[PDB]
Amino acid sequence: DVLKGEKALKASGLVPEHADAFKKIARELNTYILFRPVNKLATNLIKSGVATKGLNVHGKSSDWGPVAGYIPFDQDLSKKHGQQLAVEKGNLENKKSITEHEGEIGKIPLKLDHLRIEELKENGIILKGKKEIDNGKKYYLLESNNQVYEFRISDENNEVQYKTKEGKITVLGEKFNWRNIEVMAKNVEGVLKPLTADYDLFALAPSLTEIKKQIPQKEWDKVVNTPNEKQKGVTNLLIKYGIERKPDSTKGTLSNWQKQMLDRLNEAVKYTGYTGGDVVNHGTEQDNEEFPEKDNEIFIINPEGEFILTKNWEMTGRFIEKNITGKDYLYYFNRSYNKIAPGNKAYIEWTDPITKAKINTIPSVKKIAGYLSDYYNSANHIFSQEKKRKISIFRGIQAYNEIENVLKSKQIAPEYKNYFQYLKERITNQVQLLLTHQKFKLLYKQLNFTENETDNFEVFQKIID
Amino acid sequence: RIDVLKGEKALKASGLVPEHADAFKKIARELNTYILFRPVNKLATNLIKSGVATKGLNVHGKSSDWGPVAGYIPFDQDLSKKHGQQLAVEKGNLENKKSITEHEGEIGKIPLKLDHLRIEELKENGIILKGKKEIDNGKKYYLLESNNQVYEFRISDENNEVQYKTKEGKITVLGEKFNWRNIEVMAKNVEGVLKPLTADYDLFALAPSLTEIKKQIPQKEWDKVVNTPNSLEKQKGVTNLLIKYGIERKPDSTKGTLSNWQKQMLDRLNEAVKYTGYTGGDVVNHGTEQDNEEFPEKDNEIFIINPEGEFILTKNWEMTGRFIEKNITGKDYLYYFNRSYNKIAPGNKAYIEWTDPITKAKINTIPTSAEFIKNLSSIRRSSNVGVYKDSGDKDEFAKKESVKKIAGYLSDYYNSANHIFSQEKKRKISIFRGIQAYNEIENVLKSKQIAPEYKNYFQYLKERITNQVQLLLTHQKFKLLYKQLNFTENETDNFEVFQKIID
Amino acid sequence: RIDVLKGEKALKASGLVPEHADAFKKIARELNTYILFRPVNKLATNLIKSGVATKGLNVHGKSSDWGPVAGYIPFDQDLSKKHGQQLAVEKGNLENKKSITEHEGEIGKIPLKLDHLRIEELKENGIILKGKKEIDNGKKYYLLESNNQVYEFRISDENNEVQYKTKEGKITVLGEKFNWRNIEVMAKNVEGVLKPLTADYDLFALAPSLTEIKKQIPQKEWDKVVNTPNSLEKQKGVTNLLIKYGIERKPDSTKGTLSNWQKQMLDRLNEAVKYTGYTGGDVVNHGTEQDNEEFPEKDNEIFIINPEGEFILTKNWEMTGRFIEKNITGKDYLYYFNRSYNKIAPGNKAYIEWTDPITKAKINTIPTSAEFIKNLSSIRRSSSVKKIAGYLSDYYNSANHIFSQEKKRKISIFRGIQAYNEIENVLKSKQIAPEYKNYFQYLKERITNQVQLLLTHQKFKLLYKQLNFTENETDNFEVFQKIID
Amino acid sequence: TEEQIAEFKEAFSLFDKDGDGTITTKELGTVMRSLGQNPTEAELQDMINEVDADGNGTIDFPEFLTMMARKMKDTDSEEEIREAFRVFDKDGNGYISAAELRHVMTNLGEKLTDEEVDEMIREADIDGDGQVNYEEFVQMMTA
Amino acid sequence: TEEQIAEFKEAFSLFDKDGDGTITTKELGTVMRSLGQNPTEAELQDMINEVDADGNGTIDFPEFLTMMARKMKDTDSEEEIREAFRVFDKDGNGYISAAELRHVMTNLGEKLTDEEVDEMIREADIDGDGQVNYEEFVQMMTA
Amino acid sequence: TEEQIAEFKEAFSLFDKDGDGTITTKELGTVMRSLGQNPTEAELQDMINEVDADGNGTIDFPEFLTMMARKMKDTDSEEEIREAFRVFDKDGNGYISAAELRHVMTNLGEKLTDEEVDEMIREADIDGDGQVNYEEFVQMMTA
Ligand SMILES: Nc1ncnc2c1ncn2[C@@H]1O[C@H](COP(=O)(O)OP(=O)(O)OP(=O)(O)O)C[C@H]1O
Ligand SMILES: Nc1ncnc2c1ncn2[C@@H]1O[C@H](COP(=O)(O)OP(=O)(O)OP(=O)(O)O)C[C@H]1O
Ligand SMILES: Nc1ncnc2c1ncn2[C@@H]1O[C@H](COP(=O)(O)OP(=O)(O)OP(=O)(O)O)C[C@H]1O
Ligand SMILES: [Ca+2]
Ligand SMILES: [Ca+2]
Ligand SMILES: [Ca+2]
Ligand SMILES: [Ca+2]
Ligand SMILES: [Ca+2]
Ligand SMILES: [Ca+2]
Ligand SMILES: [Yb+3]
Ligand SMILES: [Yb+3]
Ligand SMILES: [Yb+3]
Fold first, then answer.
1. Any keyword Transferase (chain A)?
2. Of the candidates C165, C199, C233, which is a domain's last residue?
C-alpha cells in the first residue's frame, strides 16, 4: 500500500523535472534511489535554482510563513516553530555555521520576489495586502494565519520583516518590534545567496551486477579465476567496492561508488537547467549513525524509472526487504538502528535477521578447563556432513550442562539464570533442527551425563541410531 | 492536633491495595515498627491487586495516570503522567530505551492490551470511554475517548491491543505527528514471557522500635559490650551496635541502598501480600526514600501504618515532619532521614528541607578546630589560591595576629581530659576557653578586613562563641564579664583573673 | 541623526530611581565619562527607592516583574520574569538553590511581606488587586488577583505574608502542583536579620575620556615613557600605560570582572546614592556588561548619561552601536566592547554582533604567521610547505624600521608575492580537504588586495607573470626591481 | 574506553588458577581462542618477544591488555562482514542457502556449478544444517 | 573530594613557615590532629619514616595526601554516628540529656540506675552543660 | 583553551623531518618565531637545558607544549592590545593613522608635532603604507 506516479511525487517534495531526470539514472545504473521527505515549500525554490544546504548548515528549514522554504536564522521561524528547545538547538547550529564557517556560510535579509509571493498565495501560506507607513517607508503587511508573529515586506527592496503581535510573547523569552527575517546563505562568487532544502537520500540500492563493474577486472580475476577460500575472495571483494564507507569532507560518511552515483544525480539536474549547483550534498541516511532520522514517507525510484512512496516506517522496511535486501541488490541499514543512536539518542528499530533467527551459541578438579565451550571447532570441515550434525548435537548437549545445572546452586539472579535457561532453550532448537533434519524430550533419557564426554561419546554416537 | 487523615480515608488516598494495607497492619503491630509509604499511582492499585508485576530500579520510566494506559509504564513517556513536559518525557523515553537495551532480555516492551474488566475499571474511574466501531484496512477497532487533546485512541476487537495517534492539527511535545500505532508498555521477562509492569510500593521510610532492632543484635556481642567496666566504654559500645544493626545500610545489587533489617522488613512485606494472593512477585522492590540521596522525592502525602496497626496519611511535607517528630523520632524508634535533605541532591538538584535538631542548636554551640579550618577552606573557593602567607600585595608583612591560635584554642575547648574534673570545673574552664578563641578572633577583626567578608565568618564564630559562653554561665549564677579580662599580657597572667570574676 | 529618547522620557524608561540618576549626572560630569546602564526592572525602582537592598553576584536568581512578588527575587523562579521557560526557571532555582547553600548564612530566603504601601504601588502599576476575603484555619486571607492563570495568590492579615498555589487543572512549568504555600524571596543577612532583595543597577558600560584615564597613570611612569630616545619603545610603553591603567581588567571576589578605575566608579556611584538617602547599601554591585563574557545580555534599551549630565536612551542594539561610535568610540573616550561579541558566548551560547574595525581591514591586510597557524588549528576542527608561515613572518618583519616607505613597499610587495606563490602551489596537491582550498583561495585574495594596494601607492596578475620560478635564489628579487624601475 | 576493554575484564577470569588475575604464557593462546581469536602455536612467542622485553613467563592483566591493544585493528572490520552476510541471506532467515550463495555468485560474474556451491557451504558449515549462520559465516573471515 | 581534598592541603599551610610546605614531624601531630583526628604518638613515627625518608624527615602536601588518604577511609562513619545522635535526642533540642540516655539504654535491654546513667552523661559531657551535644557525642564516640 | 595546544601542534607538522615530532633546539625557534613569539635566544638555553637535560636534545611535545605554559600567563595581553588598537583607530577604518596617534598622545598629555607622529607612524609602519594595522600594532607592541 504505497503511492506511485505523479502522486508519489506530489508528496515527495522532489522537483518533477529533477525527479524525471532521475529515472534515467535509476535505469542506467540499475539501482534503487530512495529519498527522505523534502520540504515542500522549498521544492519550488529549488526549481527556481536556489542553493541547497550541505552538512555545513544543520539549521532547520521552514515550512510556514514568508521564510517558507529557507533556513531561517531565527529557528523559531522554521518547521520547529514552538518547541522551545528545538528552536534553540537549531539557533546554536546556525550560529556555529556562521562563525565556524566564516566566509563560506552567512545570513542575509529575506527578500520575497514578485513570483514567490504569488506561489505562497497558492499554498495559502501568506497573503499580501494592506499598505503601511512608518519611518517614511512603504511596507505591505504580509498576512499569515499565525498568532505569534506579524510580518510585512518592504516595497522599496522587497525585504521581509517581522515582530510580535500585541503583547504576544514568543517561545524563547523574547518580544520585539519590526525586525528583519535573516536567512542562511552561502557564498557564491563573493555574493551571498540564500539557501533552501537539499535532496536527502534515504539510501541507494545498487544491483550487485553494478557493484562488480565497480571492481577492477584484473584484481577480481586474482582471486576469482579458479584459485579455489574463494568465497572469502568475492566477499572481501564485495566488501570494499560495495560495503565499506568512509567519512568525506562535505558529504558525511559515503562510499566511493556512492560519490559517483552522487555526481550523476547532480549532473542530471543540471541538464534540466538547475543553476544552483548541487542538489544532493551528503551520504545516505543509512550512514547517518550520529543523528538517525526516522521518516514516515520515503520517495523511491526503482531501476525501472518508477515512483514509489512509503506511508510509514514499518511499510518502508517491507518494500526494502521485498525488492532490495532480498533481490540481489546491495543494501545495508544504518548501524545505529536497534540501538540507542549516540547523538540524538534515537532508538530506531529495523528487522535484523542475525537476531530473527538467534537460536544458536557462541562466546585438581577439572570442569572449567577442557573442551566445554568450543562448539564451533573449525576442525569440523573434514568430519562428514553426517558426523557434523552428529558431533554437533553432542557439543550442544555437552553445554546442556557445561556448568549450567548450577541453576539452583544458590541464589543466582534473574538474567544469568533466565539466560542460561534461555540459552538452554536455544541450544534446544539449534540441536532440534539437526535431529529433525533427518532423525531431547523425544528421548533425552537415553542421554545420561555423569561420566566424561570421552565416555558417553561412544554411547551417544549410537543412541541416535 | 495534627490534621492527618485516618483509617479508610487515608488508605484510599494512599494508593496501596486495601487488602495489602491491612495485611501490613500485622507486620506493623507485630514487629512494633512504623511503616511509611510514598504515594502510589492510584490508577495502578487495581493492576497491582490484579497481580500485575511491579517495576524495579532497572525501569525508571514513569507510570501513566491517564488514558487507556493509566497505571502502566508506557514506552512513549509522553503517555506517562509526565505528558506535556518536553524535558521530562525526554528523560523518560531515554530511560525506557536504556532499560530495553542495557538490561536486554530482562526488560522489554510489549503492546498494551486492555482486557474486558480493565476497560470497565477505567470507565468507572472516569479515565476512558469505550467509543464507536471503526473499521480500518480490514481490522475492526472501537475508539477509546479521553479528554486528551493531542492523542486519539482505539482498541482492537481481535486481540485487544490499544492504539494511539496524534489528533488532526495537533502536535506532540517532541514535535511529532503520526498515524495509528500500538501503544507500547514496559514489560519484564517473567519465565521467558514478557509481562507488563506497573507501579511498586516505594517505602518512604521505616521506623522500627529500638527494642525491635535489639533482636537484630546477636545475644553475645551485646553481652561483650554490657558486661564491661568503663561506662564510657559501655555506652560507646552500645551506640556502635545500634549503628551496626540499625543505622548502617549499604547499596545492594537491585534493592538499591537498604540496610539488613530493611531487607527483612521487605521480605516480610512482600510475603505478607503473597498470602493475600498477589501473584506478581514483590510489591516492594527497593530501599526506603531516606536512602534516595541522588534523586530525592518530596511527596506531599505520605501514607503511614503505625505499630498500633492504624492508618495515617499526612497532607503535606510539613505535616509528615511533625508526625515523624512526635510519634517516631520522639518516642524511642529507630529513624534517620535522607542525607540529601537540606542539601542540594546531586542528581535532580533537589533541595528538600528537613528539621535537623542538631542544627537547631548549632546556634549556641562553639565550632570545632575542624568545623573551622574547613569553613576556611570553602571560603577559599570564593577566592583564588596561591600563598596563605602574605595574603596581600605588600611584602612587608606575612602573618596575622592570632592566626592559627584560633583553631588551637578551639580544640582546647573540646578536651576529653575534662572528665577527671567536675561540672563546675568544666563549665568555668570551658567558659574561659570560650573567651579565649573569642579574643583571638576579636583581634583578627582588628587588623585588616583583608577578604571581603571572611569577617562575616568571624563575626559569626564570635556569635556562636558568645551563646555557648553565656550558656555555661547560665548554669551557675558575657561582654560585661569580658571587659574584666585583659588579653594583651599572656596566658599565665589572664587565667588568674577569670577564676574570681565567676563567683 | 538617530531617533533616540532623552531626558525625563528616557529616565522613565531606564528603570532607574530618579534621584539616583540625578545623582549620577554629577558623577558623569565630574569625571567626563559616559555612564551607560542596562535596563532596570521597573517594578523594582520603588523597591530600590524604598531602600530595599540590591543583589550581588552571589544571587543569580532573576527578578520578578509580575504577581505580588514583582520586584523581588523569588526563591521559586517560576514567579520571576523568566516564567514559563522551563530551563531558565530550572537554572534559576538551581542558582537560587546554590545561593542558599554555597553562601549559607550570607544569603537566605524569607516569606514575602507585602505591606499596605506596596499593595497601592502594585495597584497603580496594574500588577495585582486585593480581592474578596477568606478565612482558613482561623486566619484571615484576602485573595490577590492577577492576569496569571497558573497561580493564585493570597495575603495574611496578621503578618501580611503572601502565599500562592497552583490553580486547579493548570500545571507548573516544572510540572509541580501544590496548594497554599508561602512565597519565599531571596534575601541577604543584615546585622543578623534576613532582608529581602531586589534588582541592582547593572552597568552596560563605562566610557571615560582619555583625559580621565591619564589621571589614573602615576606622574612618573608617564614621564619615564614620554621621555625616551627611541620612538617605538616610547609608543609601545605608551600603549601599555593605556592598557595597564585603562583597558586592563581583573576578576574581583564579589564585584565580577572589572578594572580598578571601574571599581572606583562603582564606589563613587554607590557613595552618590547613599548620600541621596538610600539605605540598602550598594545599588551598583558589579562590573559592566562588557565583561560579562560568559552570559552576555543583548538589551534593546541602554540608558546613557553622557559627560554633560544629559540623559539618553537608545531604542535598539544597532542604535546603541551607532551612539557609541559617533559619540564615544571615535571621539577620544576609552572604550572596549565585550570580547564575546561577534563570537558565540561560552555560557548562554549567545551570538551578539558588534562592529569591529579590525575585521573591516582583514580583507586587505595579509595574515601574519600566528594568524596562519591559528587558522590551521581552529580550522582543524572539521577535520608540507612551512615557507608560507615564514614568508608572512617576513612580511611583518619588525626589522623594516631602518628601510624607507619607498623601500618597505618594494620588499613587502615582494615578500608578499612570495607567499602568493608558496600558496598557489599548495593549491596543487591535486586537492586536500576542500575546506582548506577556500582558506588559501581567500588568503590569495587577501594577499592580492594587499600588494595591489602597495602598488597603487607607487606605480597584480600582470606583475605576477614576472615570475621568478628560480628554485633557490635571490636573483628573483633582482628581476623584480627591474619590472618597476 | 569501556566496551573497548571490558571485552577482556570479562574473560580474563574464567581461565586462571591464580587468585590475583596473573596468568602465564601457558593459557596465553587459550584465552585468545576464547575471545574469538584462533592463533597458531607459531604465533604466540613471535609476538610476546618484542613488546615483551621481559619474558618472565608470568603475565597478568596489565600485560594482557596492552597486548591485544593494537591487535584489534584491521581485524576489527567485523562490521562490514556482518553487513556482507545480510547481502547473501536474501530471505533474511538468518542463514545462507546454496541458491543464495549461488545466486550472489552468479550475479558477481562468477558462474558457479550447481556442484561447487554445495561444496562451499559445507566448507564453512559446522552444524551440517545445510546452511551458514553469522556465527559460522564470521568464521570464514576470522580465518 | 574538591572540598575534602581542599581542606588537608588547606590546613597544611597553617603552621609551615618554610615556604616549601615542609612541615616537621613535631608540628605534624599539631596538624594531622588540629583537624578531625587524634592519632597516637605512634603513627606520628610509624608512617613518618615510611613514605617520608628523604633524610631530614620533612613533609610536603603530596606526602600529607598519602597519609590522609590512608586512615581516612573508615572515618566515613561520621554519617552514621551523626544519625545515631539524632536517635538519642528524643525531644530534638540538639543535646542528649541524662534522661534520654536511660531510654535508649533500657529499650536496648541494658537497664541502668540513675547513678550509672548520670555517670555516662557526665563522662561524655565536656563543657559541663549537663547534657551531651553533637560535638561532644562525636568525640566520645570516635576519639 | 585546547585550541591553543592544537595550534602549537600545527607548528610541528609543518617542519619536522623527524616524524614522531621530536625537533631539537636547532629548530625550536623556527616554531615560536612563525607562531607569535619573540623570546631571547638566551632563555632558549637554560630552559631547554632544565626541562630538557636528558642528554639527547630531542624536544618531543610535552617538553614544548608544557614549557610553553609560561609566557601566555603575563604577556597574554593579546586581548588588551587588540582592545587598545581599537582605541587609537577613532574613524574605525582598521588602521591607526598619524592623526589618530596624535589625538591619543595629545589627550594623554603628550603634545606632538605633525612631523613627529609621522616619525612615530613611519617607525611603526612595516609594509610602508603610512598607516599601522592590527598586525603591525601587534608587532610594534609584542616585539
Ligand atoms: N551521510 C551522512 N553522514 C553523516 N551525517 C549525516 C548523513 N546524512 C545525514 N546526516 C545527518 O543528518 C542531518 C539531517 O540533514 P539536514 O541536511 O540537516 O536535513 P534536511 O534533510 O535538509 O532537513 P530540513 O529540510 O532542513 O529539515 C545532517 C547530518 O547531521
Ligand atoms: N532506597 C533507594 N535507594 C536508591 N535509589 C532509590 C531508593 N528509593 C528510591 N530511589 C530512586 O528514586 C527513583 C524513584 O522510583 P521510581 O520507581 O522511578 O518511582 P515510582 O515510585 O515507581 O513512581 P512512578 O509511579 O513510576 O512515577 C528510583 C530510584 O532511582
Ligand atoms: N562584570 C561582570 N563580570 C562577570 N559577570 C558579570 C558581569 N556583569 C554581569 N555579569 C553576569 O551577568 C549576570 C546578569 O546579572 P544579574 O544580576 O543576574 O542580572 P540583573 O541585571 O540584576 O537582572 P534581573 O533584574 O535579575 O533580571 C550576572 C553575571 O553572571
Ligand atoms: Ca536465507
Ligand atoms: Ca550451518
Ligand atoms: Ca535531648
Ligand atoms: Ca555538654
Ligand atoms: Ca584609522
Ligand atoms: Ca602599514
Ligand atoms: Yb540534507
Ligand atoms: Yb519504585
Ligand atoms: Yb545585576
1. no
2. C199
